[PDB]
Enzyme design. Sequence first.
Site, PDB file in Angstrom:
ATOM      1  N   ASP C 110     -85.526  83.355 -31.448  1.00 49.81           N
ATOM      2  CA  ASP C 110     -85.087  83.936 -32.705  1.00 49.81           C
ATOM      3  C   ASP C 110     -85.677  83.262 -33.933  1.00 49.81           C
ATOM      4  O   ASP C 110     -85.567  83.819 -35.028  1.00 49.81           O
ATOM      5  CB  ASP C 110     -83.554  83.915 -32.800  1.00 49.81           C
ATOM      6  CG  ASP C 110     -82.944  82.578 -32.399  1.00 49.81           C
ATOM      7  OD1 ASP C 110     -82.069  82.567 -31.510  1.00 49.81           O
ATOM      8  OD2 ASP C 110     -83.307  81.540 -32.985  1.00 49.81           O
ATOM      9  N   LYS C 162     -73.147  70.206 -32.988  1.00 51.43           N
ATOM     10  CA  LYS C 162     -72.298  70.926 -33.929  1.00 51.43           C
ATOM     11  C   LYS C 162     -71.603  69.916 -34.829  1.00 51.43           C
ATOM     12  O   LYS C 162     -70.775  69.133 -34.348  1.00 51.43           O
ATOM     13  CB  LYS C 162     -71.268  71.788 -33.203  1.00 51.43           C
ATOM     14  CG  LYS C 162     -71.758  73.180 -32.880  1.00 51.43           C
ATOM     15  CD  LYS C 162     -72.308  73.878 -34.105  1.00 51.43           C
ATOM     16  CE  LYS C 162     -72.522  75.356 -33.827  1.00 51.43           C
ATOM     17  NZ  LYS C 162     -73.666  75.606 -32.913  1.00 51.43           N
ATOM     18  N   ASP C 218     -83.397  81.960 -39.279  1.00 52.05           N
ATOM     19  CA  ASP C 218     -82.980  82.419 -37.961  1.00 52.05           C
ATOM     20  C   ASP C 218     -82.671  83.911 -38.008  1.00 52.05           C
ATOM     21  O   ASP C 218     -81.928  84.368 -38.878  1.00 52.05           O
ATOM     22  CB  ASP C 218     -81.752  81.626 -37.516  1.00 52.05           C
ATOM     23  CG  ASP C 218     -81.185  82.090 -36.195  1.00 52.05           C
ATOM     24  OD1 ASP C 218     -79.981  81.863 -35.971  1.00 52.05           O
ATOM     25  OD2 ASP C 218     -81.925  82.645 -35.365  1.00 52.05           O
TER      26      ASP C 218
HETATM   27  N1  LIG Z   1     -82.763  81.898 -20.638  1.00 55.43           N
HETATM   28  C1  LIG Z   1     -81.730  81.605 -21.486  1.00 55.43           C
HETATM   29  N2  LIG Z   1     -82.036  81.473 -22.758  1.00 55.43           N
HETATM   30  C2  LIG Z   1     -81.051  81.186 -23.604  1.00 55.43           C
HETATM   31  C3  LIG Z   1     -79.748  81.031 -23.156  1.00 55.43           C
HETATM   32  N3  LIG Z   1     -78.965  80.745 -24.226  1.00 55.43           N
HETATM   33  C4  LIG Z   1     -79.729  80.718 -25.328  1.00 55.43           C
HETATM   34  N4  LIG Z   1     -81.002  80.992 -24.947  1.00 55.43           N
HETATM   35  C5  LIG Z   1     -82.039  81.010 -25.975  1.00 55.43           C
HETATM   36  O1  LIG Z   1     -82.007  79.772 -26.645  1.00 55.43           O
HETATM   37  C6  LIG Z   1     -82.127  79.975 -28.064  1.00 55.43           C
HETATM   38  C7  LIG Z   1     -80.900  79.365 -28.738  1.00 55.43           C
HETATM   39  O2  LIG Z   1     -79.756  80.150 -28.427  1.00 55.43           O
HETATM   40  P1  LIG Z   1     -78.612  80.297 -29.541  1.00 55.43           P
HETATM   41  O3  LIG Z   1     -77.302  80.474 -28.880  1.00 55.43           O
HETATM   42  O4  LIG Z   1     -78.933  81.562 -30.482  1.00 55.43           O
HETATM   43  O5  LIG Z   1     -78.560  78.984 -30.458  1.00 55.43           O
HETATM   44  P2  LIG Z   1     -78.151  78.831 -31.997  1.00 55.43           P
HETATM   45  O6  LIG Z   1     -76.571  79.026 -32.183  1.00 55.43           O
HETATM   46  O7  LIG Z   1     -78.916  79.803 -32.796  1.00 55.43           O
HETATM   47  O8  LIG Z   1     -78.556  77.331 -32.373  1.00 55.43           O
HETATM   48  C8  LIG Z   1     -79.767  76.822 -31.840  1.00 55.43           C
HETATM   49  O9  LIG Z   1     -80.881  77.191 -32.656  1.00 55.43           O
HETATM   50  C9  LIG Z   1     -80.851  76.642 -33.977  1.00 55.43           C
HETATM   51  C10 LIG Z   1     -82.097  77.032 -34.755  1.00 55.43           C
HETATM   52  O10 LIG Z   1     -82.225  78.449 -34.695  1.00 55.43           O
HETATM   53  C11 LIG Z   1     -80.808  75.123 -33.939  1.00 55.43           C
HETATM   54  O11 LIG Z   1     -80.690  74.653 -35.272  1.00 55.43           O
HETATM   55  C12 LIG Z   1     -79.608  74.666 -33.109  1.00 55.43           C
HETATM   56  O12 LIG Z   1     -79.676  73.252 -32.957  1.00 55.43           O
HETATM   57  C13 LIG Z   1     -79.628  75.310 -31.727  1.00 55.43           C
HETATM   58  O13 LIG Z   1     -80.808  74.855 -31.088  1.00 55.43           O
HETATM   59  C14 LIG Z   1     -82.208  81.491 -28.324  1.00 55.43           C
HETATM   60  O14 LIG Z   1     -83.557  81.872 -28.585  1.00 55.43           O
HETATM   61  C15 LIG Z   1     -81.784  82.126 -27.002  1.00 55.43           C
HETATM   62  O15 LIG Z   1     -82.665  83.214 -26.751  1.00 55.43           O
HETATM   63  C16 LIG Z   1     -79.495  81.185 -21.783  1.00 55.43           C
HETATM   64  O16 LIG Z   1     -78.362  81.054 -21.357  1.00 55.43           O
HETATM   65  N5  LIG Z   1     -80.494  81.475 -20.929  1.00 55.43           N
END
Ligand SMILES: Nc1nc2c(ncn2[C@@H]2O[C@H](COP(=O)(O)OP(=O)(O)O[C@H]3O[C@H](CO)[C@@H](O)[C@H](O)[C@@H]3O)[C@@H](O)[C@H]2O)c(=O)[nH]1
Lengths: 406, 406, 360
Positions: C110, C162, C218
């Site tokens: 993303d 977090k 994001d």
């Molecule tokens: N294969 C797989 N991919 C996953 C899974 N969960 C998440 N992903 C991928 O891992 C990325 C992070 O998932 P999110 O759940 O959207 O994280 P976030 O709340 O947006 O926070 C993360 O991203 C931020 C920056 O955009 C970071 O700032 C934060 O530390 C964290 O890494 C996304 O691109 C998602 O596609 C899973 O279970 N399986």
Amino acid sequence: MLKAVILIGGPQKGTRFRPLSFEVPKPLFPVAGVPMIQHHIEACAQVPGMQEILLIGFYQPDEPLTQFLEAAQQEFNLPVRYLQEFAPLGTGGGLYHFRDQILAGSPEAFFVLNADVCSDFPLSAMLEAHRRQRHPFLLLGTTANRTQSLNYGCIVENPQTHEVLHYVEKPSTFISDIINCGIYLFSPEALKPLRDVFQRNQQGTIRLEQDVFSALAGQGQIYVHLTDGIWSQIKSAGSALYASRLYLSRYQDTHPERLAKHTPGGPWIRGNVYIHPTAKVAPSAVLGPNVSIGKGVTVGEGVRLRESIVLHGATLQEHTCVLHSIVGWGSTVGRWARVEGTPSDPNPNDPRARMDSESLFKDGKLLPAITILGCRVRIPAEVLILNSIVLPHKELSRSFTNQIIL
Amino acid sequence: MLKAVILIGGPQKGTRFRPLSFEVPKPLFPVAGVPMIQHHIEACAQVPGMQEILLIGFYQPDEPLTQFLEAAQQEFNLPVRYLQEFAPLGTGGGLYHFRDQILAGSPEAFFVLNADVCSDFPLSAMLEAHRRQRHPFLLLGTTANRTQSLNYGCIVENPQTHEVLHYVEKPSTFISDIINCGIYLFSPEALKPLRDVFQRNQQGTIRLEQDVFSALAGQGQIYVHLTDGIWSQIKSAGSALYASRLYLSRYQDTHPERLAKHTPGGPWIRGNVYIHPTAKVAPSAVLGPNVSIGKGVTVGEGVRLRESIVLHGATLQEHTCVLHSIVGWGSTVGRWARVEGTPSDPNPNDPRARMDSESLFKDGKLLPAITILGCRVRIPAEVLILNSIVLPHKELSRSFTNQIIL
Amino acid sequence: MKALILVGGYGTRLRPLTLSTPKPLVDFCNKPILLHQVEALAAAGVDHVILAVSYMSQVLEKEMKAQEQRLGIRISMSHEEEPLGTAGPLALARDLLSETADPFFVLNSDVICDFPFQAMVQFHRHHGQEGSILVTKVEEPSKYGVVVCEADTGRIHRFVEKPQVFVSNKINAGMYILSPAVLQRIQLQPTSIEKEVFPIMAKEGQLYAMELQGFWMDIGQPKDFLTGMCLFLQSLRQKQPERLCSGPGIVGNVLVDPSARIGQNCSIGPNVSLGPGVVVEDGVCIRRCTVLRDARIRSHSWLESCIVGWRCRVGQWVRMENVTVLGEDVIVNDELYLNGASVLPHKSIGESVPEPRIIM
Ligand SMILES: Nc1nc2c(ncn2[C@@H]2O[C@H](COP(=O)(O)OP(=O)(O)O[C@H]3O[C@H](CO)[C@@H](O)[C@H](O)[C@@H]3O)[C@@H](O)[C@H]2O)c(=O)[nH]1
Ligand SMILES: Nc1nc2c(ncn2[C@@H]2O[C@H](COP(=O)(O)OP(=O)(O)O[C@H]3O[C@H](CO)[C@@H](O)[C@H](O)[C@@H]3O)[C@@H](O)[C@H]2O)c(=O)[nH]1
Ligand SMILES: Nc1nc2c(ncn2[C@@H]2O[C@H](COP(=O)(O)OP(=O)(O)O[C@H]3O[C@H](CO)[C@@H](O)[C@H](O)[C@@H]3O)[C@@H](O)[C@H]2O)c(=O)[nH]1
């Protein structure tokens, strides 16, 4: 020789933003396991040369308060006395009216502590600065947000000599970020300016912040000692819960035997949890972070308790979930019943956020906050209480949501 | 020979009626000048051949209750006795448990009256039907509106034989237009079904409506008798005002001396107004319709009161306007202060009226209802209390709108 | 040189668009979200990109192979049969990345920003330690994971996934360079890499930080889609101002596809991207909206801050505002006002919605 004066309030002056307890006094409300002024008494007893501790406030002496005095006197080996004002004389009026009882023995200096603050109490650091300069008033000061500073009393100081140049009390406009923390050190000369204020009232009640501090500010009489540690004010129920969290996190440095250990044979504990020795918790129960259990509490099989405070003698039956709630003493929660509240908390993006307290009604709408259960409240089985204030001695029969239940 | 059993509740049944009730039990609340059960006792003493009146409840005896009993015995020339259950036994368990005290003297029939209902009490007409039929259960019933009938016990009857074909207690959906009034007439054989229920509970609480009336209905045991007179139930604090209005309109046929005349030398009076003889009313004041004044009440000079109950010892200073409010014992209202509420009564026949809820808050905001002032509330001058509930011994400083002051 | 792209999750994201096409494939300024990242990876010079996908798709494999020889770089994908978190893709792809000893990029699906990869690989080689993390200063850091850093060396002193207490202002930008030694740390059982291994690596001090220069956003939220597109339009105007169209009837940053046809005296507002094959009639005012491919909007309609799905017919005199998302094959009737309505696919709307709610 030093004594310390704790300004416990009266019953009308509490005027609780959410009533944490309807039947016990506010200064005897158990924050993180022990009563609220017992933190002040213990931190004052750690200071060397502390001869006595006085409590000034116009509560009538009910047997809970005198019984607490019985316990504290033999616990800390200090004489702890209760001096009752004849009328509500204000913050500094009760200090002037009882000047013969405080001044007797000729103390070198004496502390004045608000009862409702939850703080680090760095009384030795204030004492070292006071022994360095011997100035009549010493004020503890903390750094706050620009929005949150309008609720407290703002202090403008000279940064080099640490002397107050301007003081203002709950200003409508922004003045300075430093806020008064309700902890002061008074030299014996400092009862002389208070007397002067009393004569101007004849042409009884002396407000210490508005009449002494806000008038003598800048004339070299008031000095601020900045500090770093934890500070909150116990005004409402949510701020009482947040202060209990602060004390449970502070307990690791001072009383590691107070926090419950992990104990894989017994109940599960994550985070900082105080459990009383008399309380019997079933081993399937799991108690989440920042949870205080009182004396005689029988937490049942399968209970989840997170961010709660359970007063003494309450019973929770099987499979109940209690989140962000204060459970009054003697209260019974039936099985599969859920008591939930909403943690207003403090902002996570703000650098110095101080967790404000709001008085039960935002703009004519009841706002979601910590669920209060009164004393001897029976919550029936399989029922939900959400964001509610329940008055004492009331047995509910159905689920309630966002309501004050009379 | 007949007697009457008045089921007064305990302290837990009066928690719905809690703000007013701290000072005195809910049955001793003065509705239209006299206590609530005193209307029942007086209408039973007006029946010929009433031997005794028994009050069955689980209130502990204190000075208000036994002082009421000592007054009512010498007032009505009848023995008024109070039998106290050991536990809350339900509506019918108290009737069965004291069956020897009830059947002492072998009465021909005995009335059973809920303490919360304000009604016509046409006990004589029920007696003339009962002497015609001599059947175990006779029920006073009344027609109600189709949306209001779901909160009361609904009775489906046959119109030709006057018999309960079916009884459903507080149904989810519409069953019948007639509702149970809560006044019944019991034969001495009527304790034979209750006994059976007791045996079924062992193989000791019996609810009369849910256990006896529901199973016994349609088998020839229970018969209806319909009244068209006034009926309301006093379940909440704001329903006492509506019941007081019903009693003040009933008072013309029974007690013409109780309602105050216009008295052109004295205070102007419109509508039905009860004034106690001890009460000092200024002649400049005007009292609107449905207004009760307690004993020792000083009403100031120029005061307007409309649809309000002023309890005894209360003090209204001059130039005040009190609409739709209950001013508690010893409460003081400062000058030019308006205490307002919005009209809301059970009114079962009417469709507009909001029906019974323990909730009091719709979505985080207080519903418009009758303003209550508890015991010893000091209202300052030039201040508005609108739609608001004030807890006892609370002094206010500014104008509160749509809040509960805790 | 290898690279991993972290896809999956199946929900919580731009749901009315995600119901008919996967999340990395939905268009974002006339290009898919994955395609921006792999084009930037082509700019970085990586020979091989693997992407972990949590559910297999026909049209995704279609699109990525048909793109994959146009790119001239083979890109493989790994299917997990349970969602093993965000860490599980590292351990499942361990030997494929571990047969040679060369540090690899890990990119979230993303995140979209300026891609600093050629500078960041020299930063990774210079600092010499195990794991490098891009970080960026943001205004609201409670939603993202928060790191504190050093002054000059950039060693991460502490990482919290977090915060809830404001330990810092800078957040995880979401772009990782991982050494092969981090692959043996994580087990095949489902873990979270952002929460688990970066915290222990922080108190070891192998983790290092690097400041991103500009316009990170994001695009997981359906609301943040529009402001991320708005920011990317300004940054692309600063870099390549020719690519944005300039006309007498369009104002602000407008990015029009060559296949899109627009009527006359219609006022396209700022930060509007039109997909390929769209047809706008006369008299449509469009501000801050993205319009995906094959969608036709009728005349005399106003659209502010809206997302129009593919093959989406919009009626005449239609007003839409407050992040209203249209999905696959929506036919909005004439003279309707939609405030905040996200629409389930293959559904036609007959009632104008005053308040924001999901229309199924
Ligand atoms: N294969 C797989 N991919 C996953 C899974 N969960 C998440 N992903 C991928 O891992 C990325 C992070 O998932 P999110 O759940 O959207 O994280 P976030 O709340 O947006 O926070 C993360 O991203 C931020 C920056 O955009 C970071 O700032 C934060 O530390 C964290 O890494 C996304 O691109 C998602 O596609 C899973 O279970 N399986
Ligand atoms: N004896 C006595 N004590 C009193 C009286 N009124 C209040 N106290 C006690 O004095 C303390 C503070 O009284 P407040 O007047 O309610 O002050 P505040 O609004 O809470 O704010 C004060 O404390 C803040 C930190 O808690 C300060 O930041 C602020 O400057 C101010 O001093 C409380 O513990 C209260 O119980 C009184 O009339 N008589
Ligand atoms: N002795 C005794 N009396 C009781 C007890 N519980 C209640 N009472 C008294 O019994 C009467 C009714 O009790 P409720 O249980 O509160 O019934 P309700 O909700 O008021 O409804 C009943 O009365 C309505 C009319 O007032 C009816 O319409 C309805 O069907 C039902 O009979 C009141 O006088 C109450 O004080 C008890 O446990 N023991």
